[PDB]
Design a protein around this ligand. Structure first.
Ligand SMILES: Nc1nc2c(ncn2[C@H]2C[C@H](O)[C@@H](COP(=O)(O)OP(=O)(O)OP(=O)(O)O)O2)c(=O)[nH]1
Ligand SMILES: *Nc1ccc2c(c1)Cc1ccccc1-2
Ligand SMILES: [Ca+2]
Ligand SMILES: [Ca+2]
Ligand SMILES: [Ca+2]
Length: 341
DNA sequence: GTTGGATGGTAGC
DNA sequence: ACGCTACCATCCAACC
């Protein structure tokens, strides 16, 4: 079995470069008015002409400007990047029908029935990289291996404008050689739980007994890491389907006043209910982001679908429930809909 | 105590 | 990403 993972290089900035080639060779930074940094926003993506100097995703814009004060700072236009992406996914479909859209710029492909071995796979990659650049003028990185996870690590090693195959041997090498942290699904929090307890490779997970690993990172991550180290990881390429649609809005000032908050909450409903686009949810959750930036939520599932009026009415009840059960002022209010009929 | 689903949260991306 | 998925401990209703 063979998996090909495509990852679009610095996607949003790249798209902006395409929609405006004058920007090529200039440092380009795509900004978001993101969580922590509600003064000047944060870097969503930067091109390599900006990354070279350390301007990377998630750093505050106030810090970017200290590095590249003459760079181009662009508002992020997600709707544009979504279109372009979908056109690329279509191009990927013409190579394999078995595809898994992991995110706006990431897709897995099962190419087992398209190639005979890794030599031929590399060339398909080259063809794919060639097609995207041709049709969308976007450099992408291609990762090829025997499974999704390793295909992904491959692309991580070759970023940007790269291509890599991790053969069956190197897979065995990486199970012994690679830092556990660089495995997909392992972030800062989980790695601490592993680095503290002497687990730095995948192979280390075969040593430790299952229950103490379960009661530390969970049944899922445990089975997942065991499976990888044991070289038995065999997860099929499946179609992802949207499972929830939500929206969060920031208020002018922190509050606990229901009448002051209601309008922002209704804004969230209108906007997320519009997005449902013919889908009928059975669950509704209201989130509050509090003044200290902690996240709280109250939801309900119905034996039937939620009409926009039920959404309005239940929402108020859910936000009342938050207001009774949490003493903190609220900074952001939001809603999400799930369990579609 | 068990089973299925629901809840409010964690973690990663 | 102020958006989303998967997961988890716990809760809940109902129970031969
Ligand atoms: N809407 C939104 N998308 C974001 C934000 N930050 C990052 N993203 C998107 C753009 C990126 O493709 C991706 C960031 O994490 P990734 O590691 O998956 O990006 P990746 O290394 O694959 O390449 P990319 O960052 O272009 O260079 O998610 C944000 O604040 N808001
Ligand atoms: N980005 C984002 C948007 C909406 C929501 C989250 C993240 C988490 C959450 C939880 C409950 C309702 C809505 C949201
Ligand atoms: Ca990317
Ligand atoms: Ca990405
Ligand atoms: Ca990691």
């Amino acid at each position: 079995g063979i998996v090909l993972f495509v990852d679009f290089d610095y996607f949003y900035a790249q798209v902006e470069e395409v929609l405006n080639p004058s920007l090529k060779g200039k440092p380009v930074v795509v900004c978001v008015f993101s969580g922590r940094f509600e003064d000047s926003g944060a870097v969503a993506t930067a091109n390599y002409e900006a990354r070279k100097f350390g301007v990377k995703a998630g750093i505050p814009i106030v810090e970017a400007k200290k590095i590249l004060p003459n760079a181009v700072y662009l508002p992020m236009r997600k709707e544009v990047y979504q279109q372009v992406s979908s056109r690329i996914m279509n191009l990927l479909r013409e190579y394999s029908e078995k595809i898994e859209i992991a995110s706006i710029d990431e897709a897995y492909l099962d190419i087992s029935d398209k190639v005979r071995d890794y030599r031929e796979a590399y060339n398909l990659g080259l063809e794919i990289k060639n097609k995207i650049l041709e049709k969308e003028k976007i450099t992408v990185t291609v990762g090829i291996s025997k499974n999704k996870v390793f295909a992904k690590i491959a692309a991580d090693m070759a970023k940007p404008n790269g291509i890599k195959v991790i053969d069956d041997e190197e897979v065995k090498r990486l199970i012994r050689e690679l830092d556990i942290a660089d495995v997909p699904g392992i972030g800062n929090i989980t790695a601490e739980k592993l680095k503290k307890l002497g687990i730095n490779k995948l192979v280390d997970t075969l040593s430790i007994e299952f229950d103490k690993l379960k009661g530390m990172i969970g049944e899922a991550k445990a089975k997942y890491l065991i499976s990888l180290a044991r070289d038995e990881y065999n997860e099929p390429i499946r179609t992802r389907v949207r499972k929830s649609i939500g929206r969060i809005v920031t208020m002018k000032r922190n509050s606990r006043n229901l009448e002051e908050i209601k309008p922002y909450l209704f804004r969230a409903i209108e906007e997320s209910y519009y997005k449902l686009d013919k889908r009928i949810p059975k669950a509704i959750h209201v989130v509050a982001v509090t003044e200290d930036l902690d996240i709280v939520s109250r939801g309900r599932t119905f034996p039937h679908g939620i009409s926009k009026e039920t959404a309005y009415s239940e929402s108020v009840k859910l936000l009342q429930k938050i207001l009774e059960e949490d003493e903190r002022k609220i900074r952001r209010i939001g809603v999400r809909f799930s369990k579609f009929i």
